Amino acid sequence: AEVARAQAALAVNISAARGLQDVLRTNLGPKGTMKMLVSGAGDIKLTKDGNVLLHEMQIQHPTASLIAKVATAQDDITGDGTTSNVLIIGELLKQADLYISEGLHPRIITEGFEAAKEKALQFLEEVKVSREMDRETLIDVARTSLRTKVHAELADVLTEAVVDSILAIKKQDEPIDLFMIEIMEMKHKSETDTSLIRGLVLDHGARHPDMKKRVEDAYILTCNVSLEYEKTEVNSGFFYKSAEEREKLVKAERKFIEDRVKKIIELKRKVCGDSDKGFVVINQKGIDPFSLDALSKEGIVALRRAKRRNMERLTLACGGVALNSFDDLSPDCLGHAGLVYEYTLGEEKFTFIEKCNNPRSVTLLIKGPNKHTLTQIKDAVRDGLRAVKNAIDDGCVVPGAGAVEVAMAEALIKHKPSVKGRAQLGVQAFADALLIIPKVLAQNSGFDLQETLVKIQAEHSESGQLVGVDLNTGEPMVAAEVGVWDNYCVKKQLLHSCTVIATNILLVDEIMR
Amino acid sequence: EVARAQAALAVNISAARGLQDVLRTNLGPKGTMKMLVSGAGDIKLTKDGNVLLHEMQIQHPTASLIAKVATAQDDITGDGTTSNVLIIGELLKQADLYISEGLHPRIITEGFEAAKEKALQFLEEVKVSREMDRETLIDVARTSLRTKVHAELADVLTEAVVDSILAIKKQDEPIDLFMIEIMEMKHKSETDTSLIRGLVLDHGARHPDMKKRVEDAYILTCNVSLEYEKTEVNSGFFYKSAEEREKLVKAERKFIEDRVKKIIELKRKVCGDSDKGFVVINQKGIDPFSLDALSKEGIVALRRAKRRNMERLTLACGGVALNSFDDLSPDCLGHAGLVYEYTLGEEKFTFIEKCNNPRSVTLLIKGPNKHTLTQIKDAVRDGLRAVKNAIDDGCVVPGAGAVEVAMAEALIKHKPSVKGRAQLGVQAFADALLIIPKVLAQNSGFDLQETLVKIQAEHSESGQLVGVDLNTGEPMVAAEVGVWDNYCVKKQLLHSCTVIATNILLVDEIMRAG
Amino acid sequence: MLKEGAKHFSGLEEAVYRNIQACKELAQTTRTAYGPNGMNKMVINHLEKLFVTNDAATILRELEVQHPAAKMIVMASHMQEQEVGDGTNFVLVFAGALLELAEELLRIGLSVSEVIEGYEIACRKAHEILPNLVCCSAKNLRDIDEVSSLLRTSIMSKQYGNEVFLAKLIAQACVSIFPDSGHFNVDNIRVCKILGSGISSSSVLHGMVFKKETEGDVTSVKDAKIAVYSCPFDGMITETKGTVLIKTAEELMNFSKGEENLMDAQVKAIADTGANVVVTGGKVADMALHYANKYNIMLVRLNSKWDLRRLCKTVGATALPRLTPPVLEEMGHCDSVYLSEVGDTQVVVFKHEKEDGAISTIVLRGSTDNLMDDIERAVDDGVNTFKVLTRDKRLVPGGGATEIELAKQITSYGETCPGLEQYAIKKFAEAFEAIPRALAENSGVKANEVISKLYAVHQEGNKNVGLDIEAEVPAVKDMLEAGILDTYLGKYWAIKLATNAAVTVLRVDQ
Lengths: 513, 514, 510
Description:
This is part of a larger assembly, with two copies of chain A and one copy of chain C. By secondary structure, chain A is α+β, with helices and mostly antiparallel strands. Chain A has helices at residues 6-23, 50-56, 63-77, 82-103, 106-127, 135-149, 152-166, 243-272, 289-298, 308-318, 371-393, 403-411, 422-434, 436-444, 449-461, 479-482, 488-507; strands spanning 3-5, 35-37, 45-47, 129-130, 183-186, 193-198, 201-202, 214-215, 218-222, 278-282, 300-303, 335-337, 339-345, 348-354, 362-367, 396-399, 467-469, 476-478, 485-487, 510-512. The two termini of chain C are 13 Å apart. Chains in contact: A-B, B-C. Chain B: It comes from Homo sapiens (Human). Chain B: Keywords: Acetylation, ATP-binding, Chaperone, Cytoplasm, Hydrolase, Isopeptide bond, Nucleotide-binding, Phosphoprotein, Ubl conjugation.
């Protein structure tokens, strides 16, 4: 129906966009703060992570959709930097406003952003320098990547743990983790903690007096459904709806049980000898008491409650292949894990598999009795594994904590274009957009936001130094000497995603109801 | 009842912002003429920044403040007051962006202080010496008049203004405070402005053609009355008896008779021939009877002249002003080399020109007696104050926002004091200046960014003060064209802008007062 | 606003839009005016009569506007009223038309200041091609047909029913006493209304006409110099009254004796001083009359304000209140004083014969004074068009026949120059087109048809249209050869002042 045209209509778009970024301005670095999000579903999500906050619920606007769409693109590739993204787009718009409001065209500002941006990708290629893929160098990047997502204390616990996860590749270098994601969550004494368990860990386990607690030569056969019913891969029906039905269901479970156990004891003997090596069976459903007695005595370790998600990972880790029935299977096709041991902590049982043949699965064990703690620590892990993952794949990494932002801004030097001045508006706006990253650290910390920034420009003038605002005191420093460096992937994908979004906002001069 | 902190700063910026709009369409020759009927309802035609603030009704404290500081600038230069407002507005705008993000007013102020010192030293570097020739005075004269009127009428006023300043060198003043007598003539066109060397008189004789060419003029300027009629007075009021009033009427008339007689004796003593004339200028009447007698002797006697005519005559002519006539030597009376009477319009103006010992020139503006003739009066006014500055300073720069881009470029690049505290105000100071050139482009219809990148680059390559060609709104070298600005114009926008800014910036409360 | 200072009623939106729409409303009274028309505009003002006009000067002064933009043009129109006659209407329609066209320019994205510049240019080119549109001119001013063709256009602009009689009449009664070559007087010609009789019965009389009846004897001497007094009689002594009738009976005897002896002296002082025609705006008593019969003085019973005014301008007279004997100082340039009845009413006739300072009177006879007020507009403009101060007045095609010629030249010329100026130059052509539009509206047909068919015939310099049936359908009439001519000077000031007025008002924003 109604239609807004011209610069009036463009105002409606940019003012909204600036306002979303203003709210989220509070986040970034560890001198930032968690934001409380409640959708329409209850539960307190306490997240400073921008990607989580955009998706679960956010202010309605047309630009609400755009800040999330670019958040979506960023997260999927790199999996860091979705807080970072928001603030530059905003500050770009601010600058663009001043000129249009003077009596200029949205479109000339837009073209100058494209010229401006292209010089800055090229700026990255110089400023970057190769740094090690050795463990301790990746600690210094991991410490920084965790800090832009979440608070200081939460960042510190996870540094060492996240590095050891991604290091246990086979020299398989990707930007993201695909199968080194395993979430195990626990309500425990320690309020916040993350534990490193290498190799794939199983959701719960069964234990018997006769069962072998420590097993040093585990031939895994992975099975699914079940000792309750023979010839199944999905569950059979039930009978109990009448009084008479109950008795029948239990009685014919004896036949079903009797057929199954036989398969397993005969396979154990081929592989292990009598009891001279150990045998592991994966029940993903109920384990009947009758079958727990026989398997346990025999030298067979039964495990109760595993997932379909464990099932995928287990196959890669042991070298075995999945079966969905409890039946005989050739020794060849069974996986080998060279250690299986069960640590029973709290009210859950974590059975580990260690000596993984092929490590592309690792497990982080999330402690947190409280709902409010669990949500903080757990959501930091995911954006954390993928952050460090970018650094190991990347051969070159860029200095961090606004080091590169201030350098690019000064080099891009005003009155370098002279073509029409259409390029001049853009290259000038883009300079001030980058310098948002100093500004928001400085806001979070003591002293005034521009007051710290002019000292960064000054120190930048002295060459041989990349200078930015610290994450942990909000003061000027040589970022490089402290060690605070950020992966290349964040910094490369930032530029492409920020320019496109904010370009489109100025192109919109007709918004239809 | 108080506006405190953010609320106090908010009030000032908002006002500056609406005002700025008005007085950009007065800026340079490409600005637009303005009239008031909003000041009092009557029709005024005015195109000066200070003047327009007085004529309106100003109640807003920020508008009023800008008008007060304006007053000082207007006296000295009379140009750059169209500009004062523009630089103030932008200067605030810059500050506002930083404050809103999170910045203190005081750090802004410090960097203004640093800004001001550097900016003033830049004037000293960049200034170009000029001569004191006519040609060079023509170009201060023409550009300043071009601000305050059209291009067409301004070129006519250019001639009048310049010959006066040359004549003022002869007196050896380094100032102007005389030769500023503006006299109006009755006409049917305004595209004439005439220069009259000596003085001009509002009214002439009531009897035409006494001797309307005086070869040798001996000017007695008097002011006692030679007409007081037949009215019955006593001390200038009615008295109780007829007779008592009458007795005085005889003696008063008798007094007048003797004074008219002294003109007859004076012509022989000073003159002696009719080969020389004799000039009388009386600011009070003279009988029709007395004019015929004087006229045949070869005396021109003027009636109903002003008190302003009298003071001017006494300076220029070397004349006297006396409350008596008597028999006086030509040593006391002033001399003028020429007298001519020029009748034009409905009122005839006796000129008394080529005075010996002048110190007053009259610039005689012809016009229809509309508001247009008042418009050239106030154009001519500030064009005299402009060429006064050229005599004051030694150095006149090419303008048209040429100076201002050069000064802004110098600030952006380095810290003038080398501290970050200064630096926050310094950005703000540099972009404030850019309003003056860019906006000449805006009026014309030429995009503002395009002229900034060009004008600034050409400075860098050359070292020329490249300016704006007003009409295209595209850059050109301001030197050749004649768009120039004095040392005093670019000094006084700078001083006014800083002082006015820092008292509004540093508000923290505005509380009402009875 | 944002300010509680800086007063404006114009600026922003209101300069661009509101000012133009106001100019447009004033100039609606002249898109029914100028040349062929049947429009009449009645305006009242509590003047105890109805005032009928189709002249811009009287419409404009009545009408007050509170905006400087609309108010300023009224002054430009008055300026053209002093220097020349008819075309006053043309000054206001032009400025007002140009300003409507201007606002459209502002809309597109063009700036104010170039548009302002392009008019000055167009005005200069239009005047430069203007004396090349002379097609006819006078050479003798004592020849009634060459003068009357000029006159005719002024009259036409009023009504299209009174063109023939009047245009002849003025030239017959003379406005050719002056050489009109350095010098012309227009306060030594008035238009004098005589109530009674028809308006084709409007007559020629030479020298000052005053309506008031003559009393006593009449003079025919050449020693007759005019003495003017507003009130020289009121009774030489005023009564007070103590019995609320008289104060009283023996006193009434003295009040009458003293009046008759003081009036004897006063009227004998007039007789002696060489004043042998006295104009009395007072009251003629029997005593005062009785004296003036003996001395031989022509006596003018009464005068009103209007009659006194023309004596002070023409004579070099003053009108003094009197009841104590005076003497000459009013003086006069009139030798002869005769007596002649115009309208069957006794009229006082002044005359002398000379070129400079010589007097004439276009005197009218009419049913009512209202009918005479419109006719008067036609006639006073016809005296003011005479003034050019040459005898070759360089007549250019009247009636709006020039207008299309100017428009064609200007639009082509516009194309040649580049930049933003040119659009203003084109608009400047279409502002002249205002005149052909107004003639079309009264004629009864649309604008499209007239402007196209005038253009179709190309360069002609004759084409204009009337109120007729010939004026509608083929939309072609000859107004070079109908003897519809106007003067070069009248069209010059009309176009000049109007361009100056349009530029100053387009500038405002305060």
